[PDB]
Amino acid sequence: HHLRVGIDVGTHSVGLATLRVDDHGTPIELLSALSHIHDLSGIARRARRLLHHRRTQLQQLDEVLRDLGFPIPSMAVRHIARHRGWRNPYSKVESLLSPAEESPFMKRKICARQGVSPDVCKQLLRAVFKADSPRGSAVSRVAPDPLPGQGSFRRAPKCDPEFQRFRIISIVANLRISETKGENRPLTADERRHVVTFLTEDSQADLTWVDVAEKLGVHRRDLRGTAVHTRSAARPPIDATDRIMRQTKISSLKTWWEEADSEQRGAMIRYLYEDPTDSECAEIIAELPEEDQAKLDSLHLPAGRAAYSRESLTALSDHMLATTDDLHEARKRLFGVDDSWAPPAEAINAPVGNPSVDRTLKIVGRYLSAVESMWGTPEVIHVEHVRDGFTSERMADERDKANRRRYNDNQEAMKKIQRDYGKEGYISRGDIVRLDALELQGCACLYCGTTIGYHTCQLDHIVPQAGPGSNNRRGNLVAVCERCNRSKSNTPFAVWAQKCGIPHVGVKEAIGRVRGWRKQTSSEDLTRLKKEVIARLRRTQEDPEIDERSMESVAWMANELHHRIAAAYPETTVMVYRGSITAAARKAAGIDSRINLIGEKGRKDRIDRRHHAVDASVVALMEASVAKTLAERSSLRGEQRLTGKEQTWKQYTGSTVGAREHFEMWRGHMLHLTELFNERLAEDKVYVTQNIRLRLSDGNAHTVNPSKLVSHRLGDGLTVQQIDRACTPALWCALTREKDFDEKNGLPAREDRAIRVHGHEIKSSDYIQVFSKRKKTDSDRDETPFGAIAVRGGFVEIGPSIHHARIYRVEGKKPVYAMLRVFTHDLLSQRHGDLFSAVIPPQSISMRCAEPKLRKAITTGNATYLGWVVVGDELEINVDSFTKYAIGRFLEDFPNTTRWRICGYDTNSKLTLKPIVLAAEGLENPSSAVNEIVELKGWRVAINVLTKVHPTVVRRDALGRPRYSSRSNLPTSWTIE
Ligand SMILES: [Mg+2]
Ligand SMILES: [Mg+2]
Ligand SMILES: [Mg+2]
Ligand SMILES: [Zn+2]
Numbered sequence: 001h002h003l004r005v006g007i008d009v010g011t012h013s014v015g016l017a018t019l020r021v022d023d024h025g026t027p028i029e030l031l032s033a034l035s036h037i038h039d040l041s042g043i044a045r046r047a048r049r050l051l052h053h054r055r056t057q058l059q060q061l062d063e064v065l066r067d068l069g070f071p072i073p074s075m076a077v078r079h080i081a082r083h084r085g086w087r088n089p090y091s092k093v094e095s096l097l098s099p100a101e102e103s104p105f106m107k108r109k110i111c112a113r114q115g116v117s118p119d120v121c122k123q124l125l126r127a128v129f130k131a132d133s134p135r136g137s138a139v140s141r142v143a144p145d146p147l148p149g150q151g152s153f154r155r156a157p158k159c160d161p162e163f164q165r166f167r168i169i170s171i172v173a174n175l176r177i178s179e180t181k182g183e184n185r186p187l188t189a190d191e192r193r194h195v196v197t198f199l200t201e202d203s204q205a206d207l208t209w210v211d212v213a214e215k216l217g218v219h220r221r222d223l224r225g226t227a228v229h230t231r232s233a234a235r236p237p238i239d240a241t242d243r244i245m246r247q248t249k250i251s252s253l254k255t256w257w258e259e260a261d262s263e264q265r266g267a268m269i270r271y272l273y274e275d276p277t278d279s280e281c282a283e284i285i286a287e288l289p290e291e292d293q294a295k296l297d298s299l300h301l302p303a304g305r306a307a308y309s310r311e312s313l314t315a316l317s318d319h320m321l322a323t324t325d326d327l328h329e330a331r332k333r334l335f336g337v338d339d340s341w342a343p344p345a346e347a348i349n350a351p352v353g354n355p356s357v358d359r360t361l362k363i364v365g366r367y368l369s370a371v372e373s374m375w376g377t378p379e380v381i382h383v384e385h386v387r388d389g390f391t392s393e394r395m396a397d398e399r400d401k402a403n404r405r406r407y408n409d410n411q412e413a414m415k416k417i418q419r420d421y422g423k424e425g426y427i428s429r430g431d432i433v434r435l436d437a438l439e440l441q442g443c444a445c446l447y448c449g450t451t452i453g454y455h456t457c458q459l460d461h462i463v464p465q466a467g468p469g470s471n472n473r474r475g476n477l478v479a480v481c482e483r484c485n486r487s488k489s490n491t492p493f494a495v496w497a498q499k500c501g502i503p504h505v506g507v508k509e510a511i512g513r514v515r516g517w518r519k520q521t522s523s524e525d526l527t528r529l530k531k532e533v534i535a536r537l538r539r540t541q542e543d544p545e546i547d548e549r550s551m552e553s554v555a556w557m558a559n560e561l562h563h564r565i566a567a568a569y570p571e572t573t574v575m576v577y578r579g580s581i582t583a584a585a586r587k588a589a590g591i592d593s594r595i596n597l598i599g600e601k602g603r604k605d606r607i608d609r610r611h612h613a614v615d616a617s618v619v620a621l622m623e624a625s626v627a628k629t630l631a632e633r634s635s636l637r638g639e640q641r642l643t644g645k646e647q648t649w650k651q652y653t654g655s656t657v658g659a660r661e662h663f664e665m666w667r668g669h670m671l672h673l674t675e676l677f678n679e680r681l682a683e684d685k686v687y688v689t690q691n692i693r694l695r696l697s698d699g700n701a702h703t704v705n706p707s708k709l710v711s712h713r714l715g716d717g718l719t720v721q722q723i724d725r726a727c728t729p730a731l732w733c734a735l736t737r738e739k740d741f742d743e744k745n746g747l748p749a750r751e752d753r754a755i756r757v758h759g760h761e762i763k764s765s766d767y768i769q770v771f772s773k774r775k776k777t778d779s780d781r782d783e784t785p786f787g788a789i790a791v792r793g794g795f796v797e798i799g800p801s802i803h804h805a806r807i808y809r810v811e812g813k814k815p816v817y818a819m820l821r822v823f824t825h826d827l828l829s830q831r832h833g834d835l836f837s838a839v840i841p842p843q844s845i846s847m848r849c850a851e852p853k854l855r856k857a858i859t860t861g862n863a864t865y866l867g868w869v870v871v872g873d874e875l876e877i878n879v880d881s882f883t884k885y886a887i888g889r890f891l892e893d894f895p896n897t898t899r900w901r902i903c904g905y906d907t908n909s910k911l912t913l914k915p916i917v918l919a920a921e922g923l924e925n926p927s928s929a930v931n932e933i934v935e936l937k938g939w940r941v942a943i944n945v946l947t948k949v950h951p952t953v954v955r956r957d958a959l960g961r962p963r964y965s966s967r968s969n970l971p972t973s974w975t976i977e
Pocket of ligand 3: 386
């Protein structure tokens with residue numbers, strides 16, 4: 001039984017698919033296919049938690065002082081002030097550097113000080129000397145180091161520079177050198193230091209193992225162990241934290257890191273990640289707001305929790321660098337564990353403190369569990385990662401905008417070439433790069449210095465690439481005279497220079513020319529370019545051949561995801577590819593326009609959300625030989641764009657009979673897959689799912705200034721509408737219990753009225769307070785109630801803070817459907833109970849804001865509670881009757897749109913609905929109605945008219961299948977009837 005799982009990670013979605021193939025890889029059954037749709041800062045929240053806890057600790061200190069015969073606000077108040085101020089918020093000691101909570105002393109004239117032996121109460125008291133200050137991480141819970149002897153140290157976050165260094169060293173410690181066969185030796189300590197120093201020189205370099213081989217002075221073929229597991233590293237490792245810090249859009253942070261103290265780099269990373277307890281930062285941080293702002297939450301440090309503490313990480317690191325041990329041997333020697341000892345891996349869904357990542361990880365974890373339970377262990381789990389991408393909606397938006405920018409800069413470059421050279425027709429990337437290089441190089445051949453121009457110069461790849469294609473990055477391309485290009489042939493520059501004997505051709509001369517480069521109009525980009533070019537001008541070995549791992553993602557989160565999945569499914573082959581693989585595959589197998597998705601196709605961006613399920617299905621079917629061939633076709637294409645010639649890359653399907661046969665077979669499989677997928681679409685079993693929130697939203701909020709309450713003299717009488725806006729439920733009870741309260745006319749004017757609210761007597765001559773949104777100079781006599789709560793200084797609205805809606809049928813000859821929106825506030829007292837059956841009493845703000853007819857029906861026992869919905873819930877709706885207004889016209893353009901998602905409660909009797917299958921971004925010049933329904937307001941429909949067509953509230957399990965019953969008490973589907 002061959003099961004292949006595919007996962008397509010997007011910015012806002014995850015496509016998921018399970019495929020059964022036979023012994024020769026032909027897809028025979030598409031078992032599952034679906035699209036799961038998703039939907040201050042950490043630094044200052046940690047700061048605030050810290051502030052409150054410390055504060056209460058200072059209060060405890062005052063408690064100690066008062067009861068110690070000291071006054072909280074002449075020697076006595078002096079001692080008070082000294083101990084409070086000059087110590088308690090100062091944390092001076094902090095002597096021998098300890099996070100050990102409690103802390104031993106280890107150690108006129110007569111008036112001060114002592115004591116003598118006592119008042120160590122005071123010393124122990126200074127915020128209890130932070131014993132124990134923290135309730136939250138990194139104390140609870142950051143799990144302890146599991147190595148024997150290390151159990152008092154907390155495990156380090158993977159973003160810690162010490163972890164990054166450990167990882168690099170560990171990988172280097174797996175490398176072998178072959179000097180004769182078969183006589184592998186590990187790298188010596190000196191070699192290890194040399195390679196580690198090299199890999200940490202520039203975290204922004206894009207190196208291959210060939211670069212490492214050259215640094216070691218060995219042929220690439222003689223360097224081994226690059227593919228050994230600690231997944232193995234296809235490319236040499238870098239410090240991912242340092243790279244992120246040097247590439248961040250937060251200017252002053254980058255600047256700081258640049259000149260930072262190294263120990264201070266570590267301390268800073270710890271601060272930004274989880275420890276709100278340094279002085280230097282945030283004394284470093286506070287500067288330059290807006291950068292301090294939501295920008296700081298945009299900083300995406302490498303995720304994950306290391307298996308070991310910093311202490312262990314550095315001990316293991318130093319040992320591996322100074323010897324020839326690998327990690328396994330290192331751990332045995334340093335800590336004495338046996339050969340079977342292994343640290344556990346984080347669970348797939350273990351939180352990384354990043355909302356998008358975390359939602360993705362929960363989805364993947366539960367899908368893989370459901371797949372295994374239902375069908376058995378998969379042979380492969382293939383993932384496609386998104387791009388850049390997968391950090392936030394924010395960073396995705398920004399990168400998209402900057403991509404439209406770069407697109408425009410390229411279009412301008414094309415225009416300028418057409419203008420300046422009169423080039424009609426296709427303007428290749430070769431044309432653009434050649435002109436750019438000519439200008440950069442001041443019209444001189446990089447290799448021999450001779451004058452060249454647009455007619456005479458040619459573009460060269462400095463370093464050739466073994467096998468089909470070349471490395472086509474700008475840093476491997478230079479403008480060159482015809483003579484040097486012809487002489488150099490297929491040789492790396494440095495090798496050719498050593499033997500060509502042409503005047504002014506050499507490595508040093510060429511480097512010199514490169515150092516001479518200046519911007520023709522981004523200096524960072526240029527500096528990077530120059531470093532890349534200089535490095536390539538030194539190279540004496542070819543770039544390595546394209547292989548099955550050329551398409552593998554090298555993003556941190558991709559490696560971490562690979563690690564968690566492989567550890568959770570040890571018998572399964574796991575791969576995480578970059579987010580271009582499925583588009584490449586779909587083009588090569590020619591299957592866009594074969595899938596029967598909604599959309600003109602017309603691509604552009606696919607409007608049908610089921611496309612993520614297509615991409616997951618395709619990635620499930622990917623295979624090593626095919627990945628290699630696709631990477632090659634792409635490289636060949638890059639090459640032929642540089643020569644601007646007749647493109648033949650589409651005809652390349654491999655260099656051996658075996659590769660070409662695999663590729664053709666795979667194209668056959670892709671054809672089968674489109675048949676199975678179309679058939680599944682026709683059964684309507686390609687699902688679109690989304691989670692619903694069942695728990696109460698907690699805290700956060702605030703940040704809100706109160707509106708003013710309005711005062712009414714009780715004795716002047718009150719209308720029903722004024723009473724319904726009473727500033728507290730208790731006041732509402734007291735007003736409506738009056739013997740002369742009238743359901744229509746409210747309370748009449750009376751001079752002898754006396755009511756009781758919380759023990760307090762309120763008389764006719766007193767004033768009560770109501771919520772109002774009107775000026776105090778206008779009448780609120782007919783103002784209807786709205787969701788509000790009293791707070792300090794007045795009230796705030798609780799607009800969309802609604803937890804669920806309960807649907808009722810008001811019984812009668814003409815039955816009427818209505819809903820009660822239950823505000824989150826009204827469930828706080830019954831938090832840990834059944835939220836959907838908690839009592840919502842007449843005096844509650846929820847009831848008082850419901851339709852009067854529903855209120856009256858509930859109070860008289862004429863309302864039948866059908867069931868509950870929440871925002872995010874799916875509705876299946878017969879839409880035949882809806883041919884009027886905006887919804888009718890929308891339906892003209894997208895007929896039989898029957899699956900809808902509840903987006904909100906437009907009013908106390910209307911739901912806002914948007915279609916589930918359709919993506920706003922895929923719209924191309926929409927009619928105003930379509931834009932209104934999909935993109936803007938959504939379909940706003942009265943509960944009574946909606947319910948008359950008997951829609952079904954659809955609830956789905958982890959495989960996206962409708963759930964009609966549950967022995968686990970999970971929410972189930974139900975028809976509103
Ligand atoms: Mg050449
Ligand atoms: Mg080649
Ligand atoms: Mg994708
Ligand atoms: Zn030349």
